Design a binder for this molecule. Structure first.
Ligand SMILES: *CC(=O)N[C@H](C)c1cccc(Cl)c1
Ligand SMILES: *CC(=O)N[C@H](C)c1cccc(Cl)c1
Lengths: 304, 304
């Protein structure tokens, strides 16, 4: 029992983190097999960041200009290519600690673990959600760029996020591992507003089922609702519209707890219309939306 | 920028987790050098748990009764001793992945990272505080026993917690790595209430300095207070009394932010007397007490 904002064990990813220096810019790279993946802005000076031509900037760079250090041993670069907003640096050595891995583009509302790094050294791990507006609310200082997000299915690490920049608003933007930004963002130090962020409705309901399983039930009410009725409320409170797909995905928690999905929606409806009344749910004074239905099942069954 | 409940990278500890089976009981062990540390209740049947004689129960057990498996390779046991509430199993092989490590007893209000394991397999990592009443609010299912808490200073892993049991209230109790329970708890399935838990005042103030650094300042007020005056409020709201030792430890955040400690206390005083007014601080709708002053400095400077 107990429910915690739980990250994946970060070992398999620690063994991949390297330092990439080009000119005077250092940031983090991901060494998998004989390739080091890093943000392409490693090639720029903070001056270039205002409107960089990455084609033109990269032409000035050779394999030998890219200094790749795993701990206290240098990797020899035999190839460099730009893919969207990442550089791939071919090294002559396959990383001996390469885990089973995939590159996956996550959907908004999905969660993943971030291993924050500085100079290719891990400092910490935390669990995130891809916001509906394709930002993440991370903890990322200067030199944190190239830090990756991931999920782990038994032995396989699915890389889903590489950290690129911090918006003026204090939120974080980055790419999948094929260098494609999540959201409308570009690797340039410019005006870039994120859209309206919504709350991830299916995650809040998931987290409400985690509460009931873990003893917190004060918010279970006598009421039910309809998808339609509940979505009028979700609209009013800038919550994602709930679909049958969201209902289907909540079935296991519905079945385990015996509380119909639309009954738990009715619970969420009253919580949104009436607030918490100074109470807490799983030690939170607001509605948590950064646990998926898969995250609640995993943590409420003990999957390693 | 951004502030997150951040765990230590768990790799160094993953490489230590083994499975320990005695009779039909499986739980997690910690393999460091040629010793596997685990909870002594591995030797019991859930029947024994009601009033176990561990001296008597352990006499019936031989080195060969302790089955120790690191992944898919068995460790040969050449010695067994009981120390307080842990067994130490001498194995014939030193763990090749033994990190630099110390055993440390933490003080209440200190934080650490927990690597939750099932059958010696890591499932997740999260950041905890030792509650003033020496409980922790973890996420620990059946078979989670032997899961360890830790801090990491560069390369050195300080082991501070081994998970033993879940109280009837849903909170968690365990030992240091010399097998001494934190709190008045015994490894027996009995009535055991925890004391009054308090809120860790110095941690809340620490977290308020993390807010100001990270942009959230709406709670800075025109007022100051005295240790004495503030402690009358702390009493009323079941907060730890604040000492000069707590003030000294907050100096770096006071200096970095230019906000005197007693001014931030005055901030906390009004927050306690007047609540949040439906607002949030670093995405929390209550006062967080599970970041230390050392935790705020580390995450607000980028220490790996
Ligand atoms: C990680 C980071 O923020 N790197 C530099 C400072 C940066 C600024 C603007 C845009 C981009 Cl992609 C990167
Ligand atoms: C981890 C755990 O809870 N193990 C068993 C179930 C247990 C019950 C009561 C007391 C103790 Cl020490 C352990």
């Amino acid at each position: 029992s107990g429910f915690r904002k739980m990250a994946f064990p970060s070992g398999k990813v620690e063994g991949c983190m390297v330092q990439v220096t080009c000119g005077t810019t250092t940031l983090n790279g991901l060494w998998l097999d004989d390739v080091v993946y890093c943000p392409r802005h490693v090639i720029c000076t903070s001056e270039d960041m205002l409107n960089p031509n990455y084609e033109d900037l990269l032409i000035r760079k050779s394999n030998h200009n890219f200094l790749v250090q795993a701990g206290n041993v240098q990797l020899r670069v035999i190839g460099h290519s730009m893919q969207n907003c990442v550089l791939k640096l071919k090294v002559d050595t396959a990383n001996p600690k390469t885990p089973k891995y995939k590159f996956v583009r996550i959907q908004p509302g999905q969660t993943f673990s971030v291993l924050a790094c500085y100079n290719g050294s891990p400092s910490g791990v935390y669990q995130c959600a891809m916001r509906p507006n394709f930002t993440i609310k991370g903890s990322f200082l200067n030199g944190s760029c190239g830090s990756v997000g991931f999920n782990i299915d038994y032995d396989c690490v699915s890389f889903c996020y590489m950290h690129h920049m911090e918006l003026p608003t204090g939120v974080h933007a980055g790419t999948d591992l094929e260098g494609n930004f999540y959201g409308p963002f570009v690797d340039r130090q410019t005006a870039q507003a994120a859209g309206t962020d919504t709350t991830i409705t299916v995650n809040v309901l998931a987290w409400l089922y985690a509460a009931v399983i873990n003893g917190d039930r004060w918010f279970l009410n006598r009421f039910t609702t309809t998808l339609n009725d509940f979505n009028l409320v979700a609209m009013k409170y800038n919550y994602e519209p709930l679909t049958q797909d969201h209902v289907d995905i909540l079935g296991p928690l519905s079945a385990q707890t015996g509380i119909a999905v639309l009954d738990m929606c009715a619970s969420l409806k009253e919580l949104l219309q009436n607030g918490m009344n100074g109470r807490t749910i799983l030690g939170s004074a607001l509605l948590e939306d950064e646990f998926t239905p898969f995250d609640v099942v995993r943590q409420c069954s003990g999957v390693t």
